[PDB]
Design an enzyme around this catalytic site. Structure first.
Site, PDB file in Angstrom:
ATOM      1  N   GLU A 296       0.766  -1.154   0.098  1.00 12.15           N
ATOM      2  CA  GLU A 296      -0.010   0.003  -0.036  1.00 12.15           C
ATOM      3  C   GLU A 296       0.767   1.190  -0.065  1.00 12.15           C
ATOM      4  O   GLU A 296       0.383   2.297  -0.607  1.00 12.15           O
ATOM      5  CB  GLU A 296      -0.927   0.049   1.174  1.00 12.15           C
ATOM      6  N   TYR A 383      -1.325  -8.241 -10.618  1.00  8.92           N
ATOM      7  CA  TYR A 383      -0.077  -8.405  -9.850  1.00  8.92           C
ATOM      8  C   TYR A 383       1.024  -8.914 -10.526  1.00  8.92           C
ATOM      9  O   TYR A 383       2.100  -8.168 -10.516  1.00  8.92           O
ATOM     10  CB  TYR A 383      -0.575  -9.015  -8.645  1.00  8.92           C
TER      11      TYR A 383
END
Ligand SMILES: [Zn+2]
Length: 609
Positions: A296, A383
């Site tokens: 994050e 991803y």
């Protein structure tokens, strides 16, 4: 006008752009409604603009005021998961670059797909209710009317009225609190977000929250039951921010607070600006999962600052984020560790191609979501196939320090903007114009537009994976008489990440004979590990190998936390294990009221209640 984003029913950014939102709302936990006004400053990109369209989903509109007069508006036919377009008849003809403020009085639906309302029983503290938003991908339109597309970026300010015993937080800088002048049982919290953001990164939390300061620009927030543990576990956040700044460029958002969500939280983290959301399953006790928030942190550059223009290009966000995150971990743990994580990522990509199938359109990097719900699409390949692309290009173009130069230049070039895969590739070719012949050997068609595994595999250093593969093949090919050889020393130079990889590989070949599992416990004492990644794979391995003793441990884990990554596969294995199946029923019944409702539901739909 050019249609940018087919997941949005609103006027495109080529037609008009929202520059600012001022939100004034009130949170009502009895009705589970957010009520108030959304004042949108909108800029016309055309001449002669007399009406504009916004996204909505399950909103109640009370009125639309422009320059002090209610104006006509109409909600159009719902288009399933896209919701309903809201056409606003403007009282004036807008010309290019002209601005208007449109104040919409609205109320959300208790069933809003963006808002997760928790009963007191679903929180740590069991006394107060709790609310948290999850706008990604296209749920912001279920909070308030907006151009609900990452192709539009806006600043915002907010004033949130809540019951005075609770605390509001947003994806913004905290800007004070006061008693609600209209109601002494309530408090107004204020927020300001001075950096333009796509609306999926508008976030709100309301709950019985407490904070600890753990860095010059970081408070950790949680319910009182978790906040001390959290202040310790994430005490190195500031040093990860500095590393990220060194890799990606300056952090532009001011504050970097953390919110550790309630145990019932069924997801992984969320990169909300100025307030990362964190799953409490990262609270291992030894900081071994603390690096997971580097993901994050990294989005503060790749996704939140440089943003994908539509959900078809989501891999730009995730892929570059994973590339940056693995560099943060490489700074922390060494380039061999970065290759270790990179290799494991390749393995996860293999698994997913095999799960979806090497033909499935969700194994493409660039996906056409025209008739696909992006709230399911962005969940997957973006991803690890995206990361693999960047790592392959890194190796082609002269290695990590040179490709990190590209990354910083790309962040600088596209800061505060939204871009497509072609914008990314045009900039790649421009930055590396000196190496165009090298770039022209890349099979772009395969990498970007074809499903399945990438056409070429990068070069991975095998140092750390080797020790894992060695120990896992010993066990997997070991007979009962051999079991006496294994012992503690097998783990001496193995990190927690290596322990996890070893279990990952052993579970790949599950089951193991009961004696092995019993022996593995005896020598390695995996029952003792509190790391949730390790414990999850160990208990899966035990149940899949039919060990009686793992049944209560697996039930406890599957209900002590709500993370779907863990709870669902555990409930699946416990139900698949004919022995635990019945006990797993009576445990899901006794506990479902403490669970996130989606987690009791899907675990119901797996257990067939
Ligand atoms: Zn992410």
């Amino acid at each position: 006008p050019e249609i940018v984003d087919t997941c949005s029913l609103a006027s495109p950014a080529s037609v008009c752009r929202t520059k600012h939102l001022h939100l004034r709302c009130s949170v009502d936990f009895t009705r589970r409604t957010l009520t108030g006004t959304a004042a949108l400053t909108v800029q016309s990109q055309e001449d002669n603009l007399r009406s504009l369209v916004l996204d909505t989903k399950d909103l109640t509109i009370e009125k639309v005021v422009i320059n002090g007069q209610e104006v006509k508006y109409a909600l159009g036919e719902r288009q399933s998961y896209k919701g309903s377009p809201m056409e606003i008849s403007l009282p004036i003809a807008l010309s290019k670059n002209q601005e208007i403020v449109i104040e919409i009085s609205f109320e959300t639906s208790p069933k809003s797909s963006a808002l997760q309302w928790l009963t007191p029983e679903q929180t740590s503290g069991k006394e107060h209710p709790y609310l948290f938003s999850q706008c990604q991908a296209i749920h912001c339109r279920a909070i308030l009317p907006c151009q609900d597309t990452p192709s539009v970026k806006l600043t915002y300010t907010a004033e949130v009225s809540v019951p005075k015993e609770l605390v509001a937080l947003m994806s913004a800088i905290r800007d004070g609190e006061t008693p609600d002048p209209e109601d002494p049982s309530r408090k107004i919290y204020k927020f300001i977000q001075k950096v333009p953001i796509p609306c999926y990164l508008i976030a709100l939390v309301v709950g019985a929250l407490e904070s600890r300061q753990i860095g010059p620009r970081t408070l950790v927030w949680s319910e009182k039951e978790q906040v001390e543990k959290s202040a310790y576990e994430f005490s190195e956040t500031e040093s990860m921010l500095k590393i990220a700044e060194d890799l990606g460029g300056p952090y532009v958002w001011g504050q970097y607070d953390l919110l550790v969500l309630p145990p019932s939280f069924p997801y992984g983290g969320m990169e909300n600006p100025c307030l990362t959301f964190v799953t409490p399953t990262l609270l291992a006790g030894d900081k071994s999962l603390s690096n997971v928030i580097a993901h994050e942190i990294s989005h503060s550059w790749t996704g939140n600052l440089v943003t994908n223009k539509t959900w078809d290009h989501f891999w730009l966000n995730e892929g570059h984020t994973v590339y940056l995150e693995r560099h943060i971990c490489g700074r922390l743990f060494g380039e061999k560790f970065r290759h270790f994580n990179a290799l494991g990522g390749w393995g996860e990509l293999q698994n997913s191609v095999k799960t979806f199938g090497e033909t499935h359109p969700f194994t493409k990097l660039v996906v056409d979501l025209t008739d696909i719900d992006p709230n399911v699409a962005y969940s997957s390949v973006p991803y690890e196939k995206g990361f693999a692309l960047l790592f392959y290009l890194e190796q082609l173009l002269g290695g990590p320090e040179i490709f990190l130069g590209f990354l910083k230049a790309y962040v600088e070039k596209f800061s505060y903007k939204s871009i497509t895969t072609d914008d990314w590739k045009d900039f790649l070719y421009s930055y590396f114009k000196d190496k165009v012949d090298v770039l022209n050997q890349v099979d772009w068609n395969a990498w970007l537009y074809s499903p399945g595994l990438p056409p070429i595999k990068p070069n991975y250093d095998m140092t750390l994976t080797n020790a894992c593969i060695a120990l896992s093949q010993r066990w997997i090919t070991a007979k009962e008489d051999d079991l006496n050889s294994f012992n503690a020393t097998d783990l001496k130079d193995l990190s927690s990440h290596q322990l996890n990889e070893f279990l990952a590989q052993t579970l790949q070949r599950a089951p193991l004979p009961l004696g092995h599992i019993k022996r593995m416990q005896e020598v390695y004492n995996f029952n003792a590990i509190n790391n949730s990644e390790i414990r999850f794979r160990w208990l899966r391995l035990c149940i899949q190998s039919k060990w009686e003793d793992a049944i209560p441990l697996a039930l406890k884990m599957a209900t002590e936390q709500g993370r779907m990554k863990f709870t669902r596969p555990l409930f699946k294995d416990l139900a698949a294990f004919d022995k635990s199946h019945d006990q797993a029923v009576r445990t899901y019944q006794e506990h479902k009221a403490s669970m996130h409702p989606v987690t009791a539901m899907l675990v119901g739909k797996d257990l067939k209640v």
